[PDB]
Design an enzyme around this catalytic site. Structure first.
Site, PDB file in Angstrom:
ATOM      1  N   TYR A  40       0.215  12.595  31.914  1.00 44.56           N
ATOM      2  CA  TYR A  40       1.380  12.017  32.125  1.00 44.56           C
ATOM      3  C   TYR A  40       2.312  10.380  31.500  1.00 44.56           C
ATOM      4  O   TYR A  40       3.634  10.171  31.428  1.00 44.56           O
ATOM      5  CB  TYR A  40       1.340  10.338  33.484  1.00 44.56           C
ATOM      6  CG  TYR A  40       0.572  11.535  34.713  1.00 44.56           C
ATOM      7  CD1 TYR A  40      -0.402  11.983  34.491  1.00 44.56           C
ATOM      8  CD2 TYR A  40       1.477  11.313  35.954  1.00 44.56           C
ATOM      9  CE1 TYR A  40      -1.216  12.884  36.762  1.00 44.56           C
ATOM     10  CE2 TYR A  40       0.737  12.472  37.159  1.00 44.56           C
ATOM     11  CZ  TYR A  40       0.021  12.684  37.634  1.00 44.56           C
ATOM     12  OH  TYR A  40      -0.411  12.818  38.665  1.00 44.56           O
TER      13      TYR A  40
ATOM     14  N   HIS B 141      -0.035  19.195  49.192  1.00 48.27           N
ATOM     15  CA  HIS B 141       0.249  19.369  47.830  1.00 48.27           C
ATOM     16  C   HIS B 141      -1.035  20.740  47.260  1.00 48.27           C
ATOM     17  O   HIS B 141      -0.496  21.243  46.451  1.00 48.27           O
ATOM     18  CB  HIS B 141      -0.701  18.360  47.096  1.00 48.27           C
ATOM     19  CG  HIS B 141       0.008  17.935  45.717  1.00 48.27           C
ATOM     20  ND1 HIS B 141       1.270  17.983  45.042  1.00 48.27           N
ATOM     21  CD2 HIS B 141      -0.801  17.745  44.519  1.00 48.27           C
ATOM     22  CE1 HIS B 141       0.552  18.224  43.536  1.00 48.27           C
ATOM     23  NE2 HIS B 141      -0.641  17.922  43.737  1.00 48.27           N
TER      24      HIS B 141
ATOM     25  N   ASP C  53       1.137  22.375  39.336  1.00 44.46           N
ATOM     26  CA  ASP C  53       1.183  20.801  39.395  1.00 44.46           C
ATOM     27  C   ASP C  53       1.076  20.518  38.229  1.00 44.46           C
ATOM     28  O   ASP C  53       2.168  20.802  37.531  1.00 44.46           O
ATOM     29  CB  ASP C  53       0.282  19.788  40.391  1.00 44.46           C
ATOM     30  CG  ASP C  53       0.086  18.221  39.438  1.00 44.46           C
ATOM     31  OD1 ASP C  53       0.679  17.625  40.681  1.00 44.46           O
ATOM     32  OD2 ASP C  53      -0.499  17.832  39.333  1.00 44.46           O
TER      33      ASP C  53
HETATM   34  C1  LIG Z   1       4.599  14.790  38.018  1.00 46.50           C
HETATM   35  N1  LIG Z   1       3.892  15.706  38.841  1.00 46.50           N
HETATM   36  C2  LIG Z   1       3.308  17.516  38.907  1.00 46.50           C
HETATM   37  C3  LIG Z   1       2.997  14.330  39.693  1.00 46.50           C
HETATM   38  O1  LIG Z   1       3.007  13.494  39.336  1.00 46.50           O
HETATM   39  N2  LIG Z   1       1.121  15.226  40.009  1.00 46.50           N
HETATM   40  C4  LIG Z   1       1.242  15.051  41.268  1.00 46.50           C
HETATM   41  C5  LIG Z   1      -0.620  15.289  41.413  1.00 46.50           C
HETATM   42  C6  LIG Z   1      -0.892  14.191  41.942  1.00 46.50           C
HETATM   43  C7  LIG Z   1      -1.112  13.269  42.208  1.00 46.50           C
HETATM   44 CL1  LIG Z   1      -2.043  13.003  43.909  1.00 46.50          CL
HETATM   45  C8  LIG Z   1       0.379  13.403  42.956  1.00 46.50           C
HETATM   46 CL2  LIG Z   1       0.572  12.121  44.320  1.00 46.50          CL
HETATM   47  C9  LIG Z   1       1.264  14.129  42.143  1.00 46.50           C
END
Ligand SMILES: CN(C)C(=O)Nc1ccc(Cl)c(Cl)c1
Ligand SMILES: CN(C)C(=O)Nc1ccc(Cl)c(Cl)c1
EC number: 3.3.2.10
Lengths: 313, 314
Positions: free
Chosen positions: A232, A290, A101
């Protein structure tokens, strides 16, 4: 407490925690969001028994590692430089970097900007996307409707309030198999947020036990979700840093492991990666969502060990 | 410390062991003596790591950041060795090279004796391997040679602790000295008052150490004191009884005995006939070297350790 706990101070305010098991080539495991070193629980003894020195990280903002409130502290540039300092203080010239991730995103940036410190690179679900110098990172998120949750994760304190409200509910709703998932990440808000379809007391997924869920609950009580969510909040900074490389190729041995049922980090996103990474090897796990390490631990262990023995050694 | 990677292993519900970690390659476990620290290996740590070894410099039980229970029984060779096995188990290490000095040197010999399957290679600075005599008292062995009088002074709990903790800066400045700079008269600890009788209130800094190096040991010993470190001496009969259980057997794993010409307590002559009990024993001898081997001659220690590790431990 059955594990050996390591602590490396990378900055006067930043200290990185890791669990250590085994002997042999250094293997640095990097978890995703909202995870822990505990996400590598099945990989740690398997990789150590295979003949490797496992270093399973508690990433910046997680568990026993330092969690500064500053957003700038969670950009790929700062995170990668801290990982280099981490290797320097441990006296490691090189290490195999395996990420999942957000950890997967970090390992690609580590392989691109610091190939002399990365013996081999492996990624679970996360592909290597070369930054477009003509396209904005915000425009890429809005293009695909599935990434609507990322925009909801931008404003500080908003997603933190929902994720910290009930930790037991948070992890029970997230850590699920794809067929057990009720998350509607493509259309976040109206009011409900990320867990609207999920009940107040969600059922336990087939991958996890009550004890495993309670471990993440205790870990996230120390710092919360600010640090993890700040990963993020650096989309523009990371895009600008990735644009500084432009055209250069990752020449070190690489592994791309795709998960069939991961609807956010889809296997199709990893296409044409061999053009930018000439020595890229491929792994594919069917019936895998995931949470790759939790979903299919045996398949992860087999793919990682086989590649480590041939390409990393 | 701040430039080092810090590791922690909980070996028992009340016992947690601290260590500094540097380098990659075969695991090398460094075990300090009395009244020392992981910091006593300061010159060996980067040198062995640069030579291609994974250095694990221990803070022995009762020292620095490691647990320090008040119990005397907790510091016997039996308990200490079992904890080191648990330390390797939780780190996922099947084997490790064990390099010891002083009381740590005694530990490494017992570790090689009772657990050779967990010791890849064994090295000892100053401390020889002496098989326990079943028909000879341990108290009478110390009383036979006049130089070991200070050990009897270290027996009663609270006595030596009060003198060693009174002034920590004076304690380390009086102990950490070269043999020609030594003011200690450990052969007569009954007529006078204490161990630092001939030493002044403000002793001069030795040629081997700097002021900042002395300050490190002071700060480390403020955490637990001298009870834990001194309890290593208070298990003579218990350690002798455990050593008698091995009787007859030989240490078959690769071994190195490093003697120091100027150590007046752990004299080089004490190491004689060790090859009879250790068939694969290799030798090292440092001239103009006192008790504080790593402190006194660091370059010589590094050269001897690296040469032996590359030929006998790999
Ligand atoms: C940009 N990336 C790797 C993500 O947004 N990964 C991510 C991590 C946790 C969750 Cl619950 C989701 Cl939906 C996406
Ligand atoms: C039994 N052993 C190894 C000792 O008594 N060693 C030792 C340690 C420190 C000092 Cl200051 C002295 Cl005189 C001897």
């Amino acid at each position: 407490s059955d594990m050996s706990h390591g602590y490396v101070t990378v900055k006067p305010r930043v200290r990185l925690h890791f669990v250590e098991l085994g002997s042999g080539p250094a293997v640095c495991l990097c978890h995703g969001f909202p995870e822990s070193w505990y996400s590598w629980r099945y990989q740690i003894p398997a990789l150590a028994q295979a003949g490797y020195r496992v270093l399973a990280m508690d990433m910046k903002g997680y568990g026993e590692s330092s969690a500064p409130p500053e957003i700038e502290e969670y950009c790929m540039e700062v995170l990668c430089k801290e990982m280099v300092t981490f290797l320097d203080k441990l006296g490691l010239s090189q290490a195999v970097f395996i990420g999942h991730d957000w950890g997967g995103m970090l390992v690609w940036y580590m392989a691109l900007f610091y190939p002399e410190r990365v013996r081999a690179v492996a990624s679970l679900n996360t592909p290597f996307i070369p930054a477009n110098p003509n396209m904005s990172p915000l425009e890429s998120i809005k293009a695909n409707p599935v990434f609507d949750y990322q925009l909801y994760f931008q404003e500080p304190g908003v997603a933190e309030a929902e994720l910290e409200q009930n930790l037991s509910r948070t992890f029970k709703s997230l850590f699920r198999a794809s067929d057990e998932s009720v998350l509607s990440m493509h259309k976040v808000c109206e009011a409900g947020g990320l867990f609207v379809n999920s009940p107040e007391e969600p059922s336990l997924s087939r991958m996890v036990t009550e004890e495993e869920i309670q471990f993440y609950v205790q870990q996230f009580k120390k710092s919360g979700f600010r640090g993890p969510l700040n990963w993020y909040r650096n989309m523009e900074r990371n895009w600008k840093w990735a644009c500084k490389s432009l055209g250069r190729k990752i020449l070190i041995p690489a592994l791309m492991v795709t998960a069939e049922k991961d609807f956010v980090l889809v296997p199709q996103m990893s296409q044409h990666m061999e053009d930018w990474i000439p020595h890229l090897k491929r792994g594919h796990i069917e019936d895998c969502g995931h949470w790759t390490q939790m979903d299919k631990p045996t398949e992860v262990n087999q793919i990682l060990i086989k590649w480590l023995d041939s390409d990393a050694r």
